[PDB]
Amino acid sequence: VKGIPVRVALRCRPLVSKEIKEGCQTCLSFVPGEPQVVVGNDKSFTYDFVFDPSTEQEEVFNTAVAPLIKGVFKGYNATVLAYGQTGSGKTYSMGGAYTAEQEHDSAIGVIPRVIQLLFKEINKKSDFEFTLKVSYLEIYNEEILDLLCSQINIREDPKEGIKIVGLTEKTVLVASDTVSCLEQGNNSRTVASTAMNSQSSRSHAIFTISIEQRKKNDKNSSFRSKLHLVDLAGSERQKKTKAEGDRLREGININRGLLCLGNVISALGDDKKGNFVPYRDSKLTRLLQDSLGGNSHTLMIACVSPADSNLEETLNTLRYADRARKIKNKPIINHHH
Numbered sequence: 295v296k297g298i299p300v301r302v303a304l305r306c307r308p309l310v311s312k313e314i315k316e317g318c319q320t321c322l323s324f325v326p327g328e329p330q331v332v333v334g335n336d337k338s339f340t341y342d343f344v345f346d347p348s349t350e351q352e353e354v355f356n357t358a359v360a361p362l363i364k365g366v367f368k369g370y371n372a373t374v375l376a377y378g379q380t381g382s383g384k385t386y387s388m389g390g391a392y393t394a395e396q397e398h399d400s401a402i403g404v405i406p407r408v409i410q411l412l413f414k415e416i417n418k419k420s421d422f423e424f425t426l427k428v429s430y431l432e433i434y435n436e437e438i439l440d441l442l443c444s445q446i447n448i449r450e451d452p453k454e455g456i457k458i459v460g461l462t463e464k465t466v467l468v469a470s471d472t473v474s475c476l477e478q479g480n481n482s483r484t485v486a487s488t489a490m491n492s493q494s495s496r497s498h499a500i501f502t503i504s505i506e507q508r509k510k511n512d513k514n515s516s517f518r519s520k521l522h523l524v525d526l527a528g529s530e531r532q533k534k535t536k537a538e539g540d541r542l543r544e545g546i547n548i549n550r551g552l553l554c555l556g557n558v559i560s561a562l563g564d565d566k567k568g569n570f571v572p573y574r575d576s577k578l579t580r581l582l583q584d585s586l587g588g589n590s591h592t593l594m595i596a597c598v599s600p601a602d603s604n605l606e607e608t609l610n611t612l613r614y615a616d617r618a619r620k621i622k623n624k625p626i627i628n629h630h631h
């Protein structure tokens with residue numbers, strides 16, 4: 295493999311209550327010390343990391359995420375995005391529903407952990423001054439909604455890419471007020487019950503931290519980068535969700551967006567001169583243009599259920615996760631002068 299691929303961590307959660315009630319057996323097995331998973335006891339996939347159901351939040355973060363976050367201090371953009379079927383563990387893994395109740399709980403996921411690490415590293419970079427800002431949006435039924443509110447349009451600037459016109463941002467100072475923004479946005483994120491997840495995310499959420507870094511003795515030059523922390527909505531099937539009405543139309547919109555994402559992953563996984571990548575098909579894929587194929591170090595956390603009743607869905611995630619690893623990104627150092 296040449297260049298800088300998208301990196302992929304496969305995270306299998308434990309069986310959940312619904313699966314135990316339905317009498318499901320585990321259909322995934324793991325090869326200890328190797329980043330491989332075997333599915334339907336027949337097909338094997340390899341990723342950059344494989345985390346079995348016993349893997350704690352802290353291990354997922356320290357092994358797969360932390361090294362990436364430390365790269366922002368070199369001036370890189372970075373993205374972590376969670377991808378998989380409804381109920382698979384995206385929100386859990388990302389801390390997409392974190393509230394202050396979870397502070398100091400070992401169950402906290404990626405976004406609160408990132409915030410802790412950023413301020414730990416800032417504290418050790420005494421020679422530098424930092425400015426952090428955050429925005430937090432959801433894509434809900436084809437609309438971009440600002441989660442830091444108690445219309446927004448994409449414009450593509452001809453130089454330097456996508457601009458989300460109307461989206462607000464908060465400048466943050468310390469860890470506490472940074473994580474408060476997560477909490478604030480999570481109180482607004484559209485969540486509702488289906489049979490597959492009592493706390494299903496009905497939107498794709500993107501928490502973005504903008505970081506500017508300047509050396510104190512050389513203050514004309516800085517680095518300016520962005521960290522995108524993405525808790526996608528997940529594929530769902532009406533026969534399993536039992537959704538009707540507004541809930542069903544949410545699932546339709548979600549599924550349609552995730553098809554557009556699959557199209558982008560598939561085009562990029564087989565990229566070459568003159569190829570076309572259909573970023574423009576959805577608002578989601580427009581916002582992920584640098585994250586997938588562009589100026590970003592990117593990790594996908596592909597989330598799966600171990601239950602045999604979800605074999606088809608799990609196979610789909612594994613296949614797209616395998617394609618994602620063939621995506622080549624081009625992260626540069628984001629100098630500003």
Ligand SMILES: Nc1ncnc2c1ncn2[C@@H]1O[C@H](COP(=O)(O)OP(=O)(O)NP(=O)(O)O)[C@@H](O)[C@H]1O
Nearest residue numbers: 307379380381382383384385386491494495527528
């Ligand atoms: N690794 C894990 N260990 C223990 N419980 C988990 C794990 N992952 C997920 N769960 C639980 O499984 C349920 C579904 O997880 P959640 O993260 O909400 O799924 P999701 O992938 O975000 N689904 P959706 O938003 O509907 O597309 C929640 O009650 C979680 O607390």
Ligand SMILES: [Mg+2]
Nearest residue numbers: 384385494495
């Ligand atoms: Mg969710």
